[PDB]
Amino acid sequence: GKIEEGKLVIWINGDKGYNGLAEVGKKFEKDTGIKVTVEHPDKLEEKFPQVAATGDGPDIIFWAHDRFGGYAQSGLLAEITPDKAFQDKLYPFTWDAVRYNGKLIAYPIAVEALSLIYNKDLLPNPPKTWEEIPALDKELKAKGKSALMFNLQEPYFTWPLIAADGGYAFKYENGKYDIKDVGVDNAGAKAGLTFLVDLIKNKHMNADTDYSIAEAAFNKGETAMTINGPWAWSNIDTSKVNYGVTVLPTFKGQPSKPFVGVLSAGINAASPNKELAKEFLENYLLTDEGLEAVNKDKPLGAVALKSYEEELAKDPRIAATMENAQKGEIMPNIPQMSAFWYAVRTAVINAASGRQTVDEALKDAQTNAAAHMLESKLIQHIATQYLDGDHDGLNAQTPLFELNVVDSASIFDLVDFLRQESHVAIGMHEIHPANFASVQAMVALVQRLQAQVAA
Ligand SMILES: [Mg+2]
């Protein structure tokens, strides 16, 4: 073919144990005569869809799973065929991260989620419930310290509590995420966010705490607890703090539901070496000995293979990661998560600051996400159609007129696209510069129009 037959080329990020992975590849070659080449290009996750579309690229790509949904929609990933006996060797939830339109499109490798991190000297037995945290803060305040500090600026960090009693990102049903069903506007998300705001109002936490401030406070022994992932363990100053890592607290007797990222291995749809790639991944890498080779080069954290997870879980920090991940929410593998992230970032910051109420903030978030999705659709349309498909500094606020895109005939083509994608009638009296000066204004017009008729 155009990818070389009888050879395996693998792409993995340079912050992974690629040298340990290469050791697995050497033993594959010893047994089969097939050479394995491990490469770690910069920006490999952007290069892959470019070169795969032309029939090129690696036979196997390693990356976080949430990117593989777009690769699959472009038809770049082969459908993988592990029998049920093999699937049984990995924790069942990991296979839900690697499915697209009913099909398995990758092998789970390692699993990552937030955990509760705590100062053992200040707090030898950390709390099991969010509810008992205000009582713990008051005791520690008497000795000039606080119970808990974590990054309240980024919704990825506050979602575990918001989703605990019923939040979700996108509804998952019949194998597919429904981008019209964002799970922010319900009683469970409101309950979680409400408990978070009341922590702020009762001064147990401060709304401006971000990543760095929380990390510094924990290293100084000023706060007994924080919330962070495995990437942060090496920055904990163990010359000052003896720390442990544990299951997140419950809310209303429900586990916190942190988002779960799954490092996954996909097979290039243009590779003629699909069967060799399956053999390598199933019978060489996804084994106690294969994962150990990678782990010894650079730790994998918690792994999807049950047997080796049991071994690594002798490290209680790793056991905690997997327990939190089993209770968490798999990150949806669709490009519309960018709308979710934007919409929920806004709502949590506003609820925390007193700007909106928990109720108004969460109801607003569904509308904001749809708005963001439409903007994205428009930006891509305008780029693909008038700019060769590349967004060279194209924003929702970019001035369409000065770009020389809103031509004298091209405007009505844009109106039509707007009519199709939003199912509203757009009269001639709405076709004026303040409505079409930017993508944001076009979306705002569409949003305003929908209400006028639906009332
Ligand atoms: Mg078998």
mmCIF file of N, CA, C and O in Angstrom, residues 123-208:
data_model
loop_
_atom_site.group_PDB
_atom_site.id
_atom_site.type_symbol
_atom_site.label_atom_id
_atom_site.label_comp_id
_atom_site.label_asym_id
_atom_site.label_seq_id
_atom_site.Cartn_x
_atom_site.Cartn_y
_atom_site.Cartn_z
ATOM 1 N N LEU A 123 -4.617 16.201 59.056
ATOM 2 C CA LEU A 123 -5.894 15.523 58.887
ATOM 3 C C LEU A 123 -5.651 14.046 58.593
ATOM 4 O O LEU A 123 -5.712 13.615 57.431
ATOM 5 N N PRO A 124 -5.351 13.245 59.618
ATOM 6 C CA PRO A 124 -5.043 11.829 59.368
ATOM 7 C C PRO A 124 -6.204 11.032 58.796
ATOM 8 O O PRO A 124 -5.964 10.031 58.106
ATOM 9 N N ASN A 125 -7.450 11.423 59.060
ATOM 10 C CA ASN A 125 -8.604 10.748 58.469
ATOM 11 C C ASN A 125 -9.496 11.768 57.765
ATOM 12 O O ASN A 125 -10.306 12.454 58.412
ATOM 13 N N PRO A 126 -9.394 11.870 56.447
ATOM 14 C CA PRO A 126 -10.121 12.907 55.705
ATOM 15 C C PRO A 126 -11.613 12.612 55.644
ATOM 16 O O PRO A 126 -12.037 11.464 55.844
ATOM 17 N N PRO A 127 -12.442 13.613 55.333
ATOM 18 C CA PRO A 127 -13.899 13.423 55.391
ATOM 19 C C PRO A 127 -14.434 12.611 54.222
ATOM 20 O O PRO A 127 -13.956 12.723 53.091
ATOM 21 N N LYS A 128 -15.452 11.790 54.506
ATOM 22 C CA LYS A 128 -16.075 10.977 53.470
ATOM 23 C C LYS A 128 -17.157 11.716 52.692
ATOM 24 O O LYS A 128 -17.576 11.228 51.635
ATOM 25 N N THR A 129 -17.638 12.852 53.189
ATOM 26 C CA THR A 129 -18.775 13.541 52.598
ATOM 27 C C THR A 129 -18.477 15.023 52.465
ATOM 28 O O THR A 129 -17.838 15.619 53.337
ATOM 29 N N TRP A 130 -18.967 15.610 51.374
ATOM 30 C CA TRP A 130 -18.928 17.059 51.221
ATOM 31 C C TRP A 130 -19.626 17.755 52.378
ATOM 32 O O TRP A 130 -19.184 18.816 52.837
ATOM 33 N N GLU A 131 -20.720 17.164 52.861
ATOM 34 C CA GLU A 131 -21.545 17.810 53.876
ATOM 35 C C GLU A 131 -20.759 18.104 55.155
ATOM 36 O O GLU A 131 -20.964 19.147 55.787
ATOM 37 N N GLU A 132 -19.839 17.221 55.544
ATOM 38 C CA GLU A 132 -19.122 17.421 56.803
ATOM 39 C C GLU A 132 -17.923 18.362 56.676
ATOM 40 O O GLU A 132 -17.174 18.513 57.648
ATOM 41 N N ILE A 133 -17.756 19.027 55.536
ATOM 42 C CA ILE A 133 -16.603 19.892 55.272
ATOM 43 C C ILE A 133 -16.728 21.256 55.953
ATOM 44 O O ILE A 133 -15.726 21.746 56.498
ATOM 45 N N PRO A 134 -17.893 21.922 55.952
ATOM 46 C CA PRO A 134 -17.986 23.175 56.730
ATOM 47 C C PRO A 134 -17.658 22.998 58.206
ATOM 48 O O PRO A 134 -17.012 23.869 58.801
ATOM 49 N N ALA A 135 -18.072 21.882 58.813
ATOM 50 C CA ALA A 135 -17.702 21.614 60.200
ATOM 51 C C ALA A 135 -16.203 21.396 60.352
ATOM 52 O O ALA A 135 -15.624 21.767 61.377
ATOM 53 N N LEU A 136 -15.561 20.786 59.357
ATOM 54 C CA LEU A 136 -14.116 20.617 59.422
ATOM 55 C C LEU A 136 -13.390 21.940 59.222
ATOM 56 O O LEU A 136 -12.335 22.162 59.829
ATOM 57 N N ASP A 137 -13.946 22.844 58.411
ATOM 58 C CA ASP A 137 -13.284 24.128 58.209
ATOM 59 C C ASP A 137 -13.225 24.933 59.502
ATOM 60 O O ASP A 137 -12.198 25.550 59.815
ATOM 61 N N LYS A 138 -14.317 24.937 60.268
ATOM 62 C CA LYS A 138 -14.357 25.743 61.483
ATOM 63 C C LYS A 138 -13.293 25.286 62.481
ATOM 64 O O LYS A 138 -12.564 26.111 63.045
ATOM 65 N N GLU A 139 -13.143 23.968 62.670
ATOM 66 C CA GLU A 139 -12.085 23.468 63.542
ATOM 67 C C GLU A 139 -10.715 23.938 63.077
ATOM 68 O O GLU A 139 -9.917 24.445 63.875
ATOM 69 N N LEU A 140 -10.418 23.769 61.787
ATOM 70 C CA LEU A 140 -9.103 24.142 61.272
ATOM 71 C C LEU A 140 -8.908 25.653 61.246
ATOM 72 O O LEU A 140 -7.771 26.133 61.368
ATOM 73 N N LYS A 141 -9.994 26.416 61.085
ATOM 74 C CA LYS A 141 -9.891 27.868 61.189
ATOM 75 C C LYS A 141 -9.442 28.303 62.582
ATOM 76 O O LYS A 141 -8.745 29.315 62.717
ATOM 77 N N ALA A 142 -9.812 27.552 63.622
ATOM 78 C CA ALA A 142 -9.369 27.897 64.970
ATOM 79 C C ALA A 142 -7.856 27.840 65.107
ATOM 80 O O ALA A 142 -7.294 28.526 65.968
ATOM 81 N N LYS A 143 -7.183 27.035 64.282
ATOM 82 C CA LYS A 143 -5.727 26.966 64.267
ATOM 83 C C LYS A 143 -5.140 27.682 63.061
ATOM 84 O O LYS A 143 -4.016 27.374 62.652
ATOM 85 N N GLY A 144 -5.886 28.621 62.482
ATOM 86 C CA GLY A 144 -5.398 29.428 61.375
ATOM 87 C C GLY A 144 -5.152 28.692 60.072
ATOM 88 O O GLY A 144 -4.156 28.970 59.392
ATOM 89 N N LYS A 145 -6.030 27.755 59.708
ATOM 90 C CA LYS A 145 -5.916 27.002 58.461
ATOM 91 C C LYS A 145 -7.315 26.735 57.919
ATOM 92 O O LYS A 145 -8.317 26.989 58.589
ATOM 93 N N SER A 146 -7.385 26.217 56.692
ATOM 94 C CA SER A 146 -8.662 25.909 56.061
ATOM 95 C C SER A 146 -8.743 24.430 55.714
ATOM 96 O O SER A 146 -7.737 23.716 55.685
ATOM 97 N N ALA A 147 -9.972 23.981 55.451
ATOM 98 C CA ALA A 147 -10.199 22.581 55.121
ATOM 99 C C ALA A 147 -9.827 22.269 53.677
ATOM 100 O O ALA A 147 -9.213 21.237 53.407
ATOM 101 N N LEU A 148 -10.187 23.132 52.733
ATOM 102 C CA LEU A 148 -10.155 22.725 51.334
ATOM 103 C C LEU A 148 -9.928 23.920 50.424
ATOM 104 O O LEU A 148 -10.639 24.924 50.515
ATOM 105 N N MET A 149 -8.973 23.785 49.509
ATOM 106 C CA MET A 149 -8.785 24.756 48.443
ATOM 107 C C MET A 149 -8.508 24.014 47.150
ATOM 108 O O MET A 149 -7.632 23.146 47.118
ATOM 109 N N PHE A 150 -9.256 24.347 46.096
ATOM 110 C CA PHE A 150 -9.000 23.811 44.766
ATOM 111 C C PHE A 150 -9.436 24.834 43.721
ATOM 112 O O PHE A 150 -10.121 25.812 44.023
ATOM 113 N N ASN A 151 -9.004 24.605 42.482
ATOM 114 C CA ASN A 151 -9.248 25.527 41.380
ATOM 115 C C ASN A 151 -10.733 25.673 41.060
ATOM 116 O O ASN A 151 -11.301 24.786 40.428
ATOM 117 N N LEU A 152 -11.357 26.786 41.455
ATOM 118 C CA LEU A 152 -12.757 27.061 41.140
ATOM 119 C C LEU A 152 -12.944 27.808 39.815
ATOM 120 O O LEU A 152 -14.084 28.123 39.451
ATOM 121 N N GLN A 153 -11.869 28.081 39.074
ATOM 122 C CA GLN A 153 -11.970 28.810 37.812
ATOM 123 C C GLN A 153 -12.312 27.922 36.624
ATOM 124 O O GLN A 153 -12.876 28.414 35.636
ATOM 125 N N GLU A 154 -11.994 26.635 36.703
ATOM 126 C CA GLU A 154 -12.070 25.714 35.579
ATOM 127 C C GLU A 154 -13.170 24.701 35.844
ATOM 128 O O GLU A 154 -13.073 23.967 36.839
ATOM 129 N N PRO A 155 -14.222 24.607 35.018
ATOM 130 C CA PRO A 155 -15.328 23.687 35.345
ATOM 131 C C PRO A 155 -14.903 22.230 35.442
ATOM 132 O O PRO A 155 -15.577 21.446 36.124
ATOM 133 N N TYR A 156 -13.802 21.836 34.796
ATOM 134 C CA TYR A 156 -13.323 20.463 34.950
ATOM 135 C C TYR A 156 -13.104 20.109 36.418
ATOM 136 O O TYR A 156 -13.338 18.963 36.816
ATOM 137 N N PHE A 157 -12.693 21.082 37.241
ATOM 138 C CA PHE A 157 -12.424 20.809 38.650
ATOM 139 C C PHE A 157 -13.682 20.838 39.508
ATOM 140 O O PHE A 157 -13.734 20.131 40.516
ATOM 141 N N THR A 158 -14.700 21.635 39.147
ATOM 142 C CA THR A 158 -15.913 21.710 39.965
ATOM 143 C C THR A 158 -17.007 20.763 39.504
ATOM 144 O O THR A 158 -17.927 20.475 40.281
ATOM 145 N N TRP A 159 -16.928 20.281 38.270
ATOM 146 C CA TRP A 159 -17.886 19.292 37.787
ATOM 147 C C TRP A 159 -18.080 18.087 38.703
ATOM 148 O O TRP A 159 -19.239 17.667 38.861
ATOM 149 N N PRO A 160 -17.040 17.480 39.315
ATOM 150 C CA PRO A 160 -17.294 16.309 40.178
ATOM 151 C C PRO A 160 -18.445 16.507 41.151
ATOM 152 O O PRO A 160 -19.231 15.580 41.369
ATOM 153 N N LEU A 161 -18.574 17.707 41.722
ATOM 154 C CA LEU A 161 -19.634 18.002 42.681
ATOM 155 C C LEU A 161 -20.954 18.364 41.983
ATOM 156 O O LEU A 161 -22.038 17.959 42.428
ATOM 157 N N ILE A 162 -20.878 19.109 40.886
ATOM 158 C CA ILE A 162 -22.078 19.491 40.150
ATOM 159 C C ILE A 162 -22.776 18.269 39.577
ATOM 160 O O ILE A 162 -24.004 18.151 39.628
ATOM 161 N N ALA A 163 -22.009 17.343 39.020
ATOM 162 C CA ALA A 163 -22.597 16.170 38.405
ATOM 163 C C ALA A 163 -22.987 15.096 39.409
ATOM 164 O O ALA A 163 -23.705 14.168 39.024
ATOM 165 N N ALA A 164 -22.531 15.194 40.667
ATOM 166 C CA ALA A 164 -22.733 14.114 41.630
ATOM 167 C C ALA A 164 -24.195 13.692 41.710
ATOM 168 O O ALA A 164 -24.514 12.502 41.642
ATOM 169 N N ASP A 165 -25.101 14.651 41.864
ATOM 170 C CA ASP A 165 -26.504 14.325 42.062
ATOM 171 C C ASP A 165 -27.316 14.391 40.781
ATOM 172 O O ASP A 165 -28.546 14.357 40.843
ATOM 173 N N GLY A 166 -26.679 14.489 39.620
ATOM 174 C CA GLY A 166 -27.487 14.378 38.420
ATOM 175 C C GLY A 166 -27.069 15.157 37.197
ATOM 176 O O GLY A 166 -27.700 15.026 36.151
ATOM 177 N N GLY A 167 -26.024 15.971 37.291
ATOM 178 C CA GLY A 167 -25.513 16.620 36.104
ATOM 179 C C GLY A 167 -24.957 15.617 35.111
ATOM 180 O O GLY A 167 -24.544 14.515 35.472
ATOM 181 N N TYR A 168 -24.971 16.002 33.833
ATOM 182 C CA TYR A 168 -24.223 15.299 32.801
ATOM 183 C C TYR A 168 -23.883 16.276 31.684
ATOM 184 O O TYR A 168 -24.499 17.333 31.553
ATOM 185 N N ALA A 169 -22.886 15.908 30.875
ATOM 186 C CA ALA A 169 -22.440 16.782 29.785
ATOM 187 C C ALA A 169 -23.410 16.732 28.604
ATOM 188 O O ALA A 169 -24.128 17.698 28.335
ATOM 189 N N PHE A 170 -23.418 15.623 27.868
ATOM 190 C CA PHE A 170 -24.413 15.363 26.834
ATOM 191 C C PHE A 170 -25.063 14.017 27.123
ATOM 192 O O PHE A 170 -24.376 13.058 27.488
ATOM 193 N N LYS A 171 -26.386 13.946 26.953
ATOM 194 C CA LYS A 171 -27.108 12.685 27.117
ATOM 195 C C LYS A 171 -26.593 11.633 26.139
ATOM 196 O O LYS A 171 -26.482 11.890 24.940
ATOM 197 N N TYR A 172 -26.287 10.442 26.651
ATOM 198 C CA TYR A 172 -25.796 9.327 25.840
ATOM 199 C C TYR A 172 -26.922 8.303 25.684
ATOM 200 O O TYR A 172 -27.386 7.736 26.679
ATOM 201 N N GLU A 173 -27.356 8.050 24.445
ATOM 202 C CA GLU A 173 -28.488 7.152 24.233
ATOM 203 C C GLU A 173 -28.450 6.577 22.819
ATOM 204 O O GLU A 173 -28.108 7.274 21.859
ATOM 205 N N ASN A 174 -28.763 5.285 22.716
ATOM 206 C CA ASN A 174 -28.593 4.508 21.486
ATOM 207 C C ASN A 174 -27.221 4.723 20.830
ATOM 208 O O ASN A 174 -27.114 4.905 19.616
ATOM 209 N N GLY A 175 -26.154 4.637 21.640
ATOM 210 C CA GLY A 175 -24.780 4.720 21.158
ATOM 211 C C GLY A 175 -24.277 6.100 20.772
ATOM 212 O O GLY A 175 -23.129 6.213 20.312
ATOM 213 N N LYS A 176 -25.075 7.159 20.960
ATOM 214 C CA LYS A 176 -24.731 8.469 20.415
ATOM 215 C C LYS A 176 -25.100 9.571 21.406
ATOM 216 O O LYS A 176 -26.111 9.489 22.108
ATOM 217 N N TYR A 177 -24.230 10.577 21.494
ATOM 218 C CA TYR A 177 -24.486 11.766 22.294
ATOM 219 C C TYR A 177 -25.454 12.684 21.557
ATOM 220 O O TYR A 177 -25.296 12.934 20.359
ATOM 221 N N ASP A 178 -26.435 13.208 22.280
ATOM 222 C CA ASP A 178 -27.432 14.122 21.730
ATOM 223 C C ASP A 178 -27.016 15.556 22.055
ATOM 224 O O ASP A 178 -27.163 16.002 23.194
ATOM 225 N N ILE A 179 -26.553 16.302 21.047
ATOM 226 C CA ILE A 179 -26.080 17.662 21.307
ATOM 227 C C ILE A 179 -27.189 18.634 21.685
ATOM 228 O O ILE A 179 -26.893 19.763 22.098
ATOM 229 N N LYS A 180 -28.452 18.231 21.577
ATOM 230 C CA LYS A 180 -29.564 19.054 22.037
ATOM 231 C C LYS A 180 -29.912 18.825 23.505
ATOM 232 O O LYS A 180 -30.793 19.516 24.025
ATOM 233 N N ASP A 181 -29.261 17.880 24.183
ATOM 234 C CA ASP A 181 -29.629 17.474 25.542
ATOM 235 C C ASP A 181 -28.423 17.648 26.469
ATOM 236 O O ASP A 181 -27.752 16.678 26.832
ATOM 237 N N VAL A 182 -28.169 18.891 26.869
ATOM 238 C CA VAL A 182 -27.107 19.216 27.815
ATOM 239 C C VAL A 182 -27.672 19.100 29.225
ATOM 240 O O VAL A 182 -28.759 19.614 29.512
ATOM 241 N N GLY A 183 -26.943 18.416 30.109
ATOM 242 C CA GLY A 183 -27.506 18.037 31.389
ATOM 243 C C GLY A 183 -27.165 18.963 32.534
ATOM 244 O O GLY A 183 -26.800 18.511 33.624
ATOM 245 N N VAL A 184 -27.303 20.265 32.298
ATOM 246 C CA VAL A 184 -26.965 21.277 33.288
ATOM 247 C C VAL A 184 -28.226 21.754 33.992
ATOM 248 O O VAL A 184 -28.190 22.140 35.165
ATOM 249 N N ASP A 185 -29.346 21.736 33.273
ATOM 250 C CA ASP A 185 -30.580 22.385 33.713
ATOM 251 C C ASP A 185 -31.520 21.360 34.350
ATOM 252 O O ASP A 185 -32.581 21.029 33.819
ATOM 253 N N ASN A 186 -31.113 20.857 35.515
ATOM 254 C CA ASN A 186 -31.913 19.879 36.245
ATOM 255 C C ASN A 186 -31.617 19.995 37.736
ATOM 256 O O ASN A 186 -30.729 20.739 38.163
ATOM 257 N N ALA A 187 -32.372 19.236 38.533
ATOM 258 C CA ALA A 187 -32.296 19.391 39.981
ATOM 259 C C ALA A 187 -30.947 18.959 40.529
ATOM 260 O O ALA A 187 -30.493 19.499 41.545
ATOM 261 N N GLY A 188 -30.302 17.982 39.890
ATOM 262 C CA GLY A 188 -29.062 17.458 40.443
ATOM 263 C C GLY A 188 -27.903 18.424 40.280
ATOM 264 O O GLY A 188 -27.129 18.646 41.215
ATOM 265 N N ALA A 189 -27.758 18.999 39.082
ATOM 266 C CA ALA A 189 -26.712 19.990 38.865
ATOM 267 C C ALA A 189 -26.940 21.216 39.737
ATOM 268 O O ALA A 189 -25.998 21.751 40.335
ATOM 269 N N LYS A 190 -28.193 21.659 39.847
ATOM 270 C CA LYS A 190 -28.495 22.795 40.710
ATOM 271 C C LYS A 190 -28.133 22.503 42.159
ATOM 272 O O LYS A 190 -27.584 23.369 42.854
ATOM 273 N N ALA A 191 -28.400 21.281 42.631
ATOM 274 C CA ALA A 191 -28.056 20.940 44.010
ATOM 275 C C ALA A 191 -26.543 20.999 44.239
ATOM 276 O O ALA A 191 -26.074 21.597 45.216
ATOM 277 N N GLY A 192 -25.768 20.392 43.336
ATOM 278 C CA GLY A 192 -24.316 20.419 43.462
ATOM 279 C C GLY A 192 -23.741 21.823 43.418
ATOM 280 O O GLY A 192 -22.931 22.200 44.269
ATOM 281 N N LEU A 193 -24.135 22.613 42.414
ATOM 282 C CA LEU A 193 -23.623 23.976 42.319
ATOM 283 C C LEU A 193 -24.065 24.816 43.516
ATOM 284 O O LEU A 193 -23.291 25.632 44.032
ATOM 285 N N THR A 194 -25.289 24.589 44.011
ATOM 286 C CA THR A 194 -25.762 25.323 45.186
ATOM 287 C C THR A 194 -24.890 25.048 46.407
ATOM 288 O O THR A 194 -24.586 25.969 47.178
ATOM 289 N N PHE A 195 -24.497 23.788 46.617
ATOM 290 C CA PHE A 195 -23.629 23.486 47.749
ATOM 291 C C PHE A 195 -22.277 24.157 47.587
ATOM 292 O O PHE A 195 -21.666 24.562 48.581
ATOM 293 N N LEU A 196 -21.805 24.285 46.345
ATOM 294 C CA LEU A 196 -20.533 24.948 46.089
ATOM 295 C C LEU A 196 -20.611 26.439 46.407
ATOM 296 O O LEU A 196 -19.696 26.997 47.025
ATOM 297 N N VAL A 197 -21.698 27.095 45.998
ATOM 298 C CA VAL A 197 -21.850 28.524 46.265
ATOM 299 C C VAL A 197 -21.959 28.778 47.764
ATOM 300 O O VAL A 197 -21.395 29.748 48.289
ATOM 301 N N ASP A 198 -22.675 27.909 48.480
ATOM 302 C CA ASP A 198 -22.840 28.115 49.911
ATOM 303 C C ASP A 198 -21.534 27.898 50.664
ATOM 304 O O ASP A 198 -21.335 28.493 51.730
ATOM 305 N N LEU A 199 -20.642 27.044 50.145
ATOM 306 C CA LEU A 199 -19.285 26.999 50.689
ATOM 307 C C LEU A 199 -18.616 28.356 50.577
ATOM 308 O O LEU A 199 -17.910 28.787 51.494
ATOM 309 N N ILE A 200 -18.823 29.040 49.454
ATOM 310 C CA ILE A 200 -18.235 30.357 49.278
ATOM 311 C C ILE A 200 -18.907 31.366 50.204
ATOM 312 O O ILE A 200 -18.235 32.113 50.927
ATOM 313 N N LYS A 201 -20.246 31.378 50.221
ATOM 314 C CA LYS A 201 -20.973 32.357 51.029
ATOM 315 C C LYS A 201 -20.640 32.229 52.509
ATOM 316 O O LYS A 201 -20.501 33.238 53.207
ATOM 317 N N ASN A 202 -20.513 31.003 53.011
ATOM 318 C CA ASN A 202 -20.115 30.770 54.390
ATOM 319 C C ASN A 202 -18.595 30.848 54.598
ATOM 320 O O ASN A 202 -18.100 30.370 55.627
ATOM 321 N N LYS A 203 -17.864 31.423 53.639
ATOM 322 C CA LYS A 203 -16.444 31.763 53.719
ATOM 323 C C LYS A 203 -15.529 30.549 53.835
ATOM 324 O O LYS A 203 -14.319 30.710 54.059
ATOM 325 N N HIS A 204 -16.059 29.336 53.690
ATOM 326 C CA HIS A 204 -15.198 28.163 53.701
ATOM 327 C C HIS A 204 -14.294 28.103 52.473
ATOM 328 O O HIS A 204 -13.252 27.440 52.519
ATOM 329 N N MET A 205 -14.668 28.771 51.381
ATOM 330 C CA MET A 205 -13.828 28.864 50.196
ATOM 331 C C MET A 205 -13.959 30.262 49.612
ATOM 332 O O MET A 205 -14.891 31.005 49.929
ATOM 333 N N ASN A 206 -13.016 30.611 48.743
ATOM 334 C CA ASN A 206 -12.999 31.906 48.082
ATOM 335 C C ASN A 206 -13.142 31.708 46.587
ATOM 336 O O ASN A 206 -12.490 30.836 46.009
ATOM 337 N N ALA A 207 -13.957 32.560 45.959
ATOM 338 C CA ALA A 207 -14.323 32.369 44.559
ATOM 339 C C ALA A 207 -13.162 32.597 43.594
ATOM 340 O O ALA A 207 -13.222 32.130 42.451
ATOM 341 N N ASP A 208 -12.112 33.298 44.014
ATOM 342 C CA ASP A 208 -11.000 33.586 43.117
ATOM 343 C C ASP A 208 -9.883 32.550 43.188
ATOM 344 O O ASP A 208 -8.918 32.651 42.422
#
